[PDB]
Amino acid sequence: KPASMYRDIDKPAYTRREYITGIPGSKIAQHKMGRKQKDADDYPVQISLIVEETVQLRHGSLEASRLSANRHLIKELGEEGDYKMTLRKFPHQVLRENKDGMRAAFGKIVGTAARVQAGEQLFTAYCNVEDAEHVKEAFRRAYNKITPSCRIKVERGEEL
Amino acid sequence: AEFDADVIVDARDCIMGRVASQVAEQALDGETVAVVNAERAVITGREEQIVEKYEKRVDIGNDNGYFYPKRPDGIFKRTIRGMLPHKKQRGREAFESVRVYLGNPYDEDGEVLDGTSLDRLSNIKFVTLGEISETLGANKTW
Amino acid sequence: PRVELEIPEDVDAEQDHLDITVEGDNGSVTRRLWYPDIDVSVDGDTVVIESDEDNAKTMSTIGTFQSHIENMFHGVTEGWEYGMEVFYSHFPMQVNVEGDEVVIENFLGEKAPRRTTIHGDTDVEIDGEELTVSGPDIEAVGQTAADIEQLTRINDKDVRVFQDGVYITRKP
Amino acid sequence: PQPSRPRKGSLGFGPRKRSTSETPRFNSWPSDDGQPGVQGFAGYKAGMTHVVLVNDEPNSPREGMEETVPVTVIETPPMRAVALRAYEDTPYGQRPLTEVWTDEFHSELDRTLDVPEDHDPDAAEEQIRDAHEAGDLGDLRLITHTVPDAVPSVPKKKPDVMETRVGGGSVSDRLDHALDIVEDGGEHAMNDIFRAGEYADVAGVTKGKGTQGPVKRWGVQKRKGKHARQGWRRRIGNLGPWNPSRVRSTVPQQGQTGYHQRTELNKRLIDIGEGDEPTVDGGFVNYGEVDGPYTLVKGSVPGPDKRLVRFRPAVRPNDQPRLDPEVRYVSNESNQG
RNA sequence: CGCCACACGGGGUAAGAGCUGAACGCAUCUAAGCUCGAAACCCACUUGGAAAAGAGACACCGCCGAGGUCCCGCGUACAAG
RNA sequence: CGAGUGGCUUGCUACCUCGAUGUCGGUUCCCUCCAUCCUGCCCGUGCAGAAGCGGGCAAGGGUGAGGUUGUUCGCCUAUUAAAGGAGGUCGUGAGCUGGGUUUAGACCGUCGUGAGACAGGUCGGCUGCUAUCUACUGGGUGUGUAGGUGUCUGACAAGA
RNA sequence: CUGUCCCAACGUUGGGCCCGGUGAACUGUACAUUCCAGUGCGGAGUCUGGAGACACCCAGGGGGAAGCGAAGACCCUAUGGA
RNA sequence: ACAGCUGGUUCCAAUCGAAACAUGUCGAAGCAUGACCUCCGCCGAGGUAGUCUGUGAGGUAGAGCGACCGAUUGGUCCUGUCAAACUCCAAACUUACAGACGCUGUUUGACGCGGGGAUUCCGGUGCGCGGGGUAAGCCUGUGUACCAGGAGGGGAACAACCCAGAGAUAGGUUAAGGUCCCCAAGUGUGGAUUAAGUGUAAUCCUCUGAAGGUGGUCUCGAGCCCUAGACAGCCGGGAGGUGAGCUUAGAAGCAGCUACCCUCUAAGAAAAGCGUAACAGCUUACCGGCCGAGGUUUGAGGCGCCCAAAAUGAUCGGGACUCAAAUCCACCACCGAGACCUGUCCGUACCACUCAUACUGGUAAUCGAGUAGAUUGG
Ligand SMILES: COC(=O)C[C@](O)(CCCC(C)(C)O)C(=O)O[C@@H]1C(OC)=C[C@]23CCCN2CCc2cc4c(cc2[C@H]13)OCO4
Ligand SMILES: [Cl-]
Ligand SMILES: [Cl-]
Ligand SMILES: [Cl-]
Ligand SMILES: [Cl-]
Ligand SMILES: [Cl-]
Ligand SMILES: [Cl-]
Ligand SMILES: [Cl-]
Ligand SMILES: [K+]
Ligand SMILES: [Mg+2]
Ligand SMILES: [Mg+2]
Ligand SMILES: [Mg+2]
Ligand SMILES: [Mg+2]
Ligand SMILES: [Mg+2]
Ligand SMILES: [Mg+2]
Ligand SMILES: [Mg+2]
Ligand SMILES: [Mg+2]
Ligand SMILES: [Mg+2]
Ligand SMILES: [Mg+2]
Ligand SMILES: [Mg+2]
Ligand SMILES: [Mg+2]
Ligand SMILES: [Mg+2]
Ligand SMILES: [Mg+2]
Ligand SMILES: [Mg+2]
Ligand SMILES: [Mg+2]
Ligand SMILES: [Mg+2]
Ligand SMILES: [Mg+2]
Ligand SMILES: [Mg+2]
Ligand SMILES: [Mg+2]
Ligand SMILES: [Mg+2]
Ligand code: NA
Ligand code: NA
Ligand code: NA
Ligand code: NA
Numbered sequence A: 001k002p003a004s005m006y007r008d009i010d011k012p013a014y015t016r017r018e019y020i021t022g023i024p025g026s027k028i029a030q031h032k033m034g035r036k037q038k039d040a041d042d043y044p045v046q047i048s049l050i051v052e053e054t055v056q057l058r059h060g061s062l063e064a065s066r067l068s069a070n071r072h073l074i075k076e077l078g079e080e081g082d083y084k085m086t087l088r089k090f091p092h093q094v095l096r097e098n099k100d101g102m103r104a105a106f107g108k109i110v111g112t113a114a115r116v117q118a119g120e121q122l123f124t125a126y127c128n129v130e131d132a133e134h135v136k137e138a139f140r141r142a143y144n145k146i147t148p149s150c151r152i153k154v155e156r157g158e159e160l
Numbered sequence B: 001a002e003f004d005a006d007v008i009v010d011a012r013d014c015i016m017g018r019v020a021s022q023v024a025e026q027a028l029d030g031e032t033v034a035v036v037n038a039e040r041a042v043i044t045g046r047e048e049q050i051v052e053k054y055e056k057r058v059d060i061g062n063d064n065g066y067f068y069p070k071r072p073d074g075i076f077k078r079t080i081r082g083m084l085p086h087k088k089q090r091g092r093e094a095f096e097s098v099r100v101y102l103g104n105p106y107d108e109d110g111e112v113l114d115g116t117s118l119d120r121l122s123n124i125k126f127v128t129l130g131e132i133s134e135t136l137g138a139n140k141t142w
Numbered sequence C: 001p002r003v004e005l006e007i008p009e010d011v012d013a014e015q016d017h018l019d020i021t022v023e024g025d026n027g028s029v030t031r032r033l034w035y036p037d038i039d040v041s042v043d044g045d046t047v048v049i050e051s052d053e054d055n056a057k058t059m060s061t062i063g064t065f066q067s068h069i070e071n072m073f074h075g076v077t078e079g080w081e082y083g084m085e086v087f088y089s090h091f092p093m094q095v096n097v098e099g100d101e102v103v104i105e106n107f108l109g110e111k112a113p114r115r116t117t118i119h120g121d122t123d124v125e126i127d128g129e130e131l132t133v134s135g136p137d138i139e140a141v142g143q144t145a146a147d148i149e150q151l152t153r154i155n156d157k158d159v160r161v162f163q164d165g166v167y168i169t170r171k172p
Numbered sequence D: 001p002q003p004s005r006p007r008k009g010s011l012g013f014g015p016r017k018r019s020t021s022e023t024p025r026f027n028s029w030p031s032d033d034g035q036p037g038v039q040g041f042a043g044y045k046a047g048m049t050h051v052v053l054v055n056d057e058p059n060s061p062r063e064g065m066e067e068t069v070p071v072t073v074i075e076t077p078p079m080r081a082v083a084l085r086a087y088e089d090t091p092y093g094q095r096p097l098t099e100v101w102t103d104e105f106h107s108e109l110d111r112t113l114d115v116p117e118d119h120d121p122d123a124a125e126e127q128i129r130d131a132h133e134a135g136d137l138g139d140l141r142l143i144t145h146t147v148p149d150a151v152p153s154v155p156k157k158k159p160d161v162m163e164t165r166v167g168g169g170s171v172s173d174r175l176d177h178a179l180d181i182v183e184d185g186g187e188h189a190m191n192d193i194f195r196a197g198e199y200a201d202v203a204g205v206t207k208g209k210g211t212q213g214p215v216k217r218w219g220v221q222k223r224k225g226k227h228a229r230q231g232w233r234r235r236i237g238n239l240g241p242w243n244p245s246r247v248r249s250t251v252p253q254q255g256q257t258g259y260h261q262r263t264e265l266n267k268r269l270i271d272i273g274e275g276d277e278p279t280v281d282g283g284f285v286n287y288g289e290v291d292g293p294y295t296l297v298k299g300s301v302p303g304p305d306k307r308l309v310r311f312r313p314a315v316r317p318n319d320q321p322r323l324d325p326e327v328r329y330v331s332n333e334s335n336q337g
Numbered sequence E: 001c002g003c004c005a006c007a008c009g010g011g012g013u014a015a016g017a018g019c020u021g022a023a024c025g026c027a028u029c030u031a032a033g034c035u036c037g038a039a040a041c042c043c044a045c046u047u048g049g050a051a052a053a054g055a056g057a058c059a060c061c062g063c064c065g066a067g068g069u070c071c072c073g074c075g076u077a078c079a080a081g
Numbered sequence F: 001c002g003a004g005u006g007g008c009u010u011g012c013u014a015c016c017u018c019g020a021u022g023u024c025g026g027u028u029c030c031c032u033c034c035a036u037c038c039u040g041c042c043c044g045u046g047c048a049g050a051a052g053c054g055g056g057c058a059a060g061g062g063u064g065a066g067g068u069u070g071u072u073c074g075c076c077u078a079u080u081a082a083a084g085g086a087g088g089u090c091g092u093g094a095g096c097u098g099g100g101u102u103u104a105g106a107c108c109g110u111c112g113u114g115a116g117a118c119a120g121g122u123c124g125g126c127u128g129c130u131a132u133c134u135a136c137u138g139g140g141u142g143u144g145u146a147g148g149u150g151u152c153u154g155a156c157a158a159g160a
Numbered sequence G: 001c002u003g004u005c006c007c008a009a010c011g012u013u014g015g016g017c018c019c020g021g022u023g024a025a026c027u028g029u030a031c032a033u034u035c036c037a038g039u040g041c042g043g044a045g046u047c048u049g050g051a052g053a054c055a056c057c058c059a060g061g062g063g064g065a066a067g068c069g070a071a072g073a074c075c076c077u078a079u080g081g082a
Numbered sequence H: 001a002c003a004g005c006u007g008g009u010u011c012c013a014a015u016c017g018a019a020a021c022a023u024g025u026c027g028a029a030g031c032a033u034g035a036c037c038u039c040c041g042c043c044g045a046g047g048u049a050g051u052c053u054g055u056g057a058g059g060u061a062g063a064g065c066g067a068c069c070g071a072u073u074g075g076u077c078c079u080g081u082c083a084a085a086c087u088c089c090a091a092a093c094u095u096a097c098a099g100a101c102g103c104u105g106u107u108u109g110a111c112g113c114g115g116g117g118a119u120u121c122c123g124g125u126g127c128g129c130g131g132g133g134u135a136a137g138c139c140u141g142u143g144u145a146c147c148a149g150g151a152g153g154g155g156a157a158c159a160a161c162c163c164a165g166a167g168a169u170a171g172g173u174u175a176a177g178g179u180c181c182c183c184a185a186g187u188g189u190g191g192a193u194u195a196a197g198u199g200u201a202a203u204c205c206u207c208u209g210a211a212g213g214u215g216g217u218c219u220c221g222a223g224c225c226c227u228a229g230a231c232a233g234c235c236g237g238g239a240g241g242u243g244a245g246c247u248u249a250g251a252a253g254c255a256g257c258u259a260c261c262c263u264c265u266a267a268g269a270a271a272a273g274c275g276u277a278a279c280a281g282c283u284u285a286c287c288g289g290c291c292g293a294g295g296u297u298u299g300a301g302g303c304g305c306c307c308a309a310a311a312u313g314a315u316c317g318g319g320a321c322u323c324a325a326a327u328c329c330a331c332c333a334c335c336g337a338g339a340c341c342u343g344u345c346c347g348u349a350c351c352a353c354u355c356a357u358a359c360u361g362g363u364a365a366u367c368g369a370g371u372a373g374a375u376u377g378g
């Protein structure tokens, strides 16, 4: 199904699992990547992926953008490299689909999406100075797999 | 044939639509206008898109017809007609008292109207009316 | 901006409207240099290329006009020479200058002669396997040279195996 | 998905209406090459016979062998170039300037024209030369007529007047060549313009068929099978789609067929002669007997017998001229039988 | 169902191949400029076209007479015209 | 995974017409679109050549005959440069056809107590009208330009 | 076996066309020379913008007037009928 | 015959002016009762469409959750997220009553009460907030204004978008919108951007244009380098110990492993990239010369470009427009309604005089559009 059906915040917040049954599991395998034993303050460089438009990003898009981002970091910095990436948004919004015409139209549960407001950090990676251009490329691949245009903003790093 | 014109306009190196707008205004005020050197009249912009518009106007038509002129003689005359209510009595009289010419059939030199002239030293993206007509397929008789 | 170009002693150049004529011992070259708000004039012993605007587009052309005039200076004195070599593998290629055009016969076994016309006052001299395209106008010489290489263009078959043709050896 | 098929008939010979002049009018003339000369002639269609000929084509496997070729016999007696018209280059195209006429006229030319009694051939010639000096002279053409009186099979005596161009050398030399033809009496023959073996373009006004339906006029199908018995035999399916809500002029409809001007290209002149050599036994059907100046055109020619056909040197030939073909035999067998 | 005829070539382009060339000393097919380059576009060729309201041009004849219509014998024409 | 374009399929809606805008398929005749099957010119190649594969420009022309089936679709055969797709009220019944859908007769299967039913199958089963306007194909009569004969010009127009 | 087809042709008779005589009907809110686009209750000769368009008449085959003919037989609705 | 269904129902004018909703109904194409419209009689001094303040009511937006609740990460306290049916918090705002100001009423009697007559119970659209649905010129709520039943001006045309609510006639000035022509008013002024005909399209079924990309161009900021010569280009040098060692038939910058050391010097790696079976060969680092002025890295903004395919004839309404007739920032002067101002007249209401509802005089900034319907004079 296209994202055109779910990308906008046009419906109420539908998260309450005590009233909703049959919710498909999240396709997101990991949320804490790289070296999850080390601290975020132990790194000199902190670069985040900032979403420019207020959207709803599905669990399938989150997994696709996370996979294409972390796979590049595993390719360039190694499987046990000196970095740590975080996906801070979780898919709370439960999604429906009306799949009888418009009669009894309340749709059955088909998926989950993450409500991300404009200006928010979806991804945040902490790396060293020499690995900074490899992570900007991981985010360049990650923004092509989500709905809005994005900013790759450097938060802690006057090393240029 | 003779045409006793009150005003004789020199279209040479002048922006067509601007001359046309003034010639229309004057014809409705009762003036007998004669546009001269229309082959040398100018129209600004990228040649490729200008010719594309004029080529489409030639290709457009059906049984009822869309008679679009290829010569600079008629192109300027049509440009003037679009600025005149030619279907109405007053408008037709104004239009019929305006004639466009290839070259200058008169002894008098035409007057260059204000704001119409184009400085060639300041512009490169423009076309001569005759250049449009040659591309349209008209026989160069000027 | 304003760029002044000192004219060589061998050369003397006149100008009318937008056209600049440059005469010398190797010939005469006339070129049209037209661009918005760029005035090219002859101030006795120097050629002046000036404009009131300093934008990227105007600057691009001022520098192009400079190189064109400096090339015309070189053309009417030392001239422009492009050297070419004719290579053949199986079929003996007959390159000859028949009139105001250079004809190539029996290329790759063809019965029909391939021919291109020489641009302007450009001279094509052939000494067996070597050809030298020469003249005052770089535009005319550069093209006539290129036209000869392009004349033996092959699109249908592999260029790596069928390498026959006249190629540019020396660029001035 | 319903098979494709080219449209019925050509749209380039329209509108399919009756011709204004029965005398054909060329819309194009040959290019100026060698020596000056009149760019055309005219005759009267006689009928058809066949000729046994020797193959002239150097690229044919049959070069030198006997080949039977169909031929249209056209009676081509001498014509009279009674005047020289000159055109000037105006910003509105070519406009006629002046005409230089003669004194010697044919006895029965007054059946068509109001023959000149008072004319100044010198002031006219002067006006044309002042225009040549000014660089305003366009082309030079001759006012020419036929002598149907010389043809016994054609009922008319009233001459067919037509304009013919003079092309060739320089504008100065062809002005002089033109004035020489005129000032004598205007008499010129087919030989003066054409040589046997050259390619000519024959123009003619076709055989009139009055009003005919789409099947004959445009070559549309007749209704097939079951559709042929329902009340519709020779009528087209529809006059067009629902939209556009009008009948397009491109749809095959009824009307005038025939009596249109056609200019048949690249016709080989097999022989140009004089006498009764191509005449058929019992005479040409609906025409008569030929005993005078003739031309033998390869194949068919537009128009019926007795009609005025026009000649012009081919403006677009495909083959190179193979002059004076060897005529082994000309059939004189009756066209009845 | 038989027979005859129905180009080539020019001009300007697309994709593309290039020349000269700067911004940006170099480089660069392009930004200005230029050489090429499609069955495609324009011309060439055929057909119509003085009702093109700027309603056209030329030559001769004529204004007490040029010419046309009717009439008559007929078709290279034609449903009336 | 993300972003779109189209308006050929399907679905949704119930805005328009129930004092009726004749339903599928086919046929015949005309115009068009390009997302190009062939043909022209090109770029790449895992481009030696030959034959291909992929891509670009391009709608001038072409894209055909047949066997089953009412079929559209599709399967199949032999040819072919190729035998492209789509829009025009799913173009076209005051043009045709009437094989299918979908009246009234009848049979079979299934369902029903029954009348009778079926988004099952099957045999049979109708096609109205003299064109007022408009549109176009061809043909005339007048008026305008402003006496006559003959010859032309060429704004435009059509072509594959 | 053959014109059902390829693929159409020519001919025959009666019409059709012109003339004398006889002489209806269907249909008609008005206006009306239209065409291309647009707009509008989303399927316009009449609205908007342009284009084209001198008037009248003859013959034609029927593209359009969502043509004429029949208060839709389908479908639903009616505290309708049989 | 009956029908809750379709059609039709004939003269003028003046005042007021809806409902397309609620409850019940074999009810949903209909009725009844309310709401709402109108008319009459009664009552007799208050009333409350706006605002402010005071005394109260509330849990929506937002926010947050070691504040409940239930969702929802990882690590050896820290770290990552959420809620229509969660709340430790919490608006704007809506709302009860009262006072004050405002407005209104006491001859135009308001507020209220009683009675007669209805019409109406298919609604629609814009905006705000919604719920369903991929969406819809979808379905279904809610507040509001409008169309319906609303003219006139503008918007190309176009119920509901903008101005505007309108007796007649007349003069004037503006509103929306517009001032190159068609077309009334500017080819207005100062300045900048754009080269695509971008654009000349407020809103929209209607006006598309996206993710992604862009040394197209303009503008602004930051760091670093530079006349002790920067960036680039071109010339010259790119040397020895030694062809490092290990590995290996061999490997000598450059198959692999490890080391990666010092001379000469102005530089020159235990070699950055090709190249060879291995050498050789070509250049990179680094140094010097020629040259001579800015250069280089990164950030932000403006307009444009690519992305961008459809059917009879292209389009901003058309013509056409390029230091604009585009776009952005300012500014100047005009054109332009029935609005507003103004003269006269008419109707209606009320006041004075009157028997009069006949004259006459006066008041209306706070009267003048209208479908269904009520009322009244002709
Ligand atoms: C169910 O199909 C039918 O009933 C066909 C017919 O009955 C045909 C009537 C033909 C007449 C008698 C009017 O000549 C009819 O009235 O059709 C309507 C009809 O009659 C005018 C036209 C309709 C109305 C919308 C357009 N459509 C075209 C024809 C049609 C075809 C249909 C259709 C409806 C229509 C309607 O159902 C599916 O197939
Ligand atoms: Cl047309
Ligand atoms: Cl008008
Ligand atoms: Cl320019
Ligand atoms: Cl048929
Ligand atoms: Cl009001
Ligand atoms: Cl434009
Ligand atoms: Cl009254
Ligand atoms: K209907
Ligand atoms: Mg090959
Ligand atoms: Mg015979
Ligand atoms: Mg015989
Ligand atoms: Mg119909
Ligand atoms: Mg394409
Ligand atoms: Mg086509
Ligand atoms: Mg259909
Ligand atoms: Mg039809
Ligand atoms: Mg029918
Ligand atoms: Mg009929
Ligand atoms: Mg059957
Ligand atoms: Mg059946
Ligand atoms: Mg009915
Ligand atoms: Mg029924
Ligand atoms: Mg019953
Ligand atoms: Mg009344
Ligand atoms: Mg009254
Ligand atoms: Mg919230
Ligand atoms: Mg209403
Ligand atoms: Mg004005
Ligand atoms: Mg545009
Ligand atoms: Na159901
Ligand atoms: Na233009
Ligand atoms: Na046209
Ligand atoms: Na019949």
Ligand code: NA
Residues within 6 Å of the ligand: D242
């Ligand atoms: Na139809």
Ligand code: NA
Residues within 6 Å of the ligand: none
């Ligand atoms: Na060409």
Ligand code: NA
Residues within 6 Å of the ligand: F005
């Ligand atoms: Na779409």
Ligand code: NA
Residues within 6 Å of the ligand: none
């Ligand atoms: Na059909």
Ligand code: NA
Residues within 6 Å of the ligand: F059
């Ligand atoms: Na094509």
Ligand code: NA
Residues within 6 Å of the ligand: none
């Ligand atoms: Na089949």
Ligand code: NA
Residues within 6 Å of the ligand: F089
């Ligand atoms: Na239909």
Ligand code: NA
Residues within 6 Å of the ligand: F093, F127
């Ligand atoms: Na039928």
Ligand code: NA
Residues within 6 Å of the ligand: F093
């Ligand atoms: Na049908």
Ligand code: NA
Residues within 6 Å of the ligand: G003
């Ligand atoms: Na038969």
Ligand code: NA
Residues within 6 Å of the ligand: G062, G063
């Ligand atoms: Na019709």
Ligand code: NA
Residues within 6 Å of the ligand: H002, H003
């Ligand atoms: Na009843």
Ligand code: NA
Residues within 6 Å of the ligand: H027, H028
């Ligand atoms: Na009800």
Ligand code: NA
Residues within 6 Å of the ligand: H004, H029, H030
């Ligand atoms: Na009811």
Ligand code: NA
Residues within 6 Å of the ligand: none
């Ligand atoms: Na009060």
Ligand code: NA
Residues within 6 Å of the ligand: H061
């Ligand atoms: Na909110």
